[PDB]
Write a structure and sequence with these properties.
part of a larger assembly, 2 chains, 98 residues, 60% helix, Dual E2 ubiquitin-conjugating enzyme/E3 ubiquitin-protein ligase BIRC6 (chain A), apoptosis, Inhibitor of apoptosis protein, birc6
């Protein structure tokens, strides 16, 4: 009884590991383990680079404690220098968490 | 060896290339290297730095002789020949620009080979090792460039390509061991005939075309020295 319209259906997510286990169906695995170790090292290196640049960017930030009306007006105006700093923090944090 | 200083002559591009070869896509300034405006230069850039290196060293100095022999020992020029073998083989303008991109690949790798045979600069047979002639004979570069060797519109399309071919032929004419590699001289007679045909057309009705004819005369004199 639904009326005709445009339909948007989320397909969702499917999560699974790649077939490398021989017993799960019913050496290559050691080479795959070495490749996984090298991949873990590479991702750790890029993550540590992202952590270093995020740590320097976090040291660049000041934050007022809302003690006065001037800090309140700073939060209300949201100045464009603070906007670009927060955008840099958002980009670096997204890289770090991914 | 010696590539380092010439790479350091272009410092920001050197940093981008070294960050890509170390495996990171970012420069540390918040911008990706591929999104940077320099990134159009980097695919053809190490060939440019190598061509500046080979033009910088003369054949007379023993460090240059060790440099050519070290280039053969690594075999990076063999991978140049492999790239030329695999590269010798939507929008129409986009596909034409893609063929242009492989065309400056031929221009820059072919500048590399022209500066490798002859240092040129201001401007010997035992200084160059003998195995490079044999591996260029193994390479399909010479028949492919002889096919690339006809029409004045055709040089009007690809000006840096035909310039790189012409200076390759001048470098081959300079060397005594490279004149066996060229047949190709008769094809060069056909293009100088085409240059004379365009001379007839300008008699009926650029500066590069008489220089192409002059370099053709130089390589023809090299063929006469080979036949003698």
């Amino acid at each position: 009884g639904s009326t005709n319209a445009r339909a948007k259906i989320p397909l969702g997510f499917y999560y699974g590991h790649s077939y490398i286990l021989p017993w799960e169906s019913e050496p290559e695995i050691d080479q795959h383990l070495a490749m996984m170790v090298a991949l873990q090292e590479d991702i750790q290196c890029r993550y540590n680079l992202a952590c270093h640049r995020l740590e320097a960017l976090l040291q660049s930030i000041d934050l007022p404690p809302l003690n006065s009306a001037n800090n309140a007006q700073y939060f209300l105006r949201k100045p464009d220098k603070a906007v670009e700093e927060d955008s840099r923090v958002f980009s670096a944090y997204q890289d770090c968490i991914q | 060896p010696g590539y380092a200083e010439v790479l350091l002559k272009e410092r920001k591009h050197a940093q981008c290339l070294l960050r890509l070869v170390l495996g990171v896509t970012d420069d540390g300034e918040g911008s990706h290297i591929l999104q940077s405006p320099s990134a159009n230069v980097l695919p053809t850039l190490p060939f440019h730095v190598l061509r500046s290196l080979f033009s910088a060293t003369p054949l007379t100095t023993d460090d240059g002789v060790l440099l050519r022999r070290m280039a053969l020992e690594i075999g990076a020029l063999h991978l140049i020949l492999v790239c030329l073998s695999a590269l010798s083989h939507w929008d129409v303008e986009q596909a034409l620009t893609k063929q242009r991109l492989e065309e400056e690949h031929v221009t820059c790798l072919l500048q590399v080979l022209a500066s490798y045979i002859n240092p040129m600069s201001g401007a010997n047979s035992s200084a160059l090792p003998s195995m490079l002639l044999e591996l260029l004979s193994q390479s399909c570069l010479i028949p492919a460039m002889s096919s690339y060797l006809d029409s004045v519109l055709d040089m009007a399309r690809h000006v840096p390509l035909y310039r790189a071919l012409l200076e390759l032929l001048r470098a081959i004419a300079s060397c005594t061991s490279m004149v066996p590699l060229l047949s190709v001289g008769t094809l060069l007679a056909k293009m100088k005939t085409c240059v004379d045909t365009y001379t007839n057309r300008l008699r009926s009705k650029a500066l590069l075309v008489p220089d192409i004819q002059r370099t053709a005369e130089i390589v023809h004199a090299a063929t006469a020295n080979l036949r003698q």
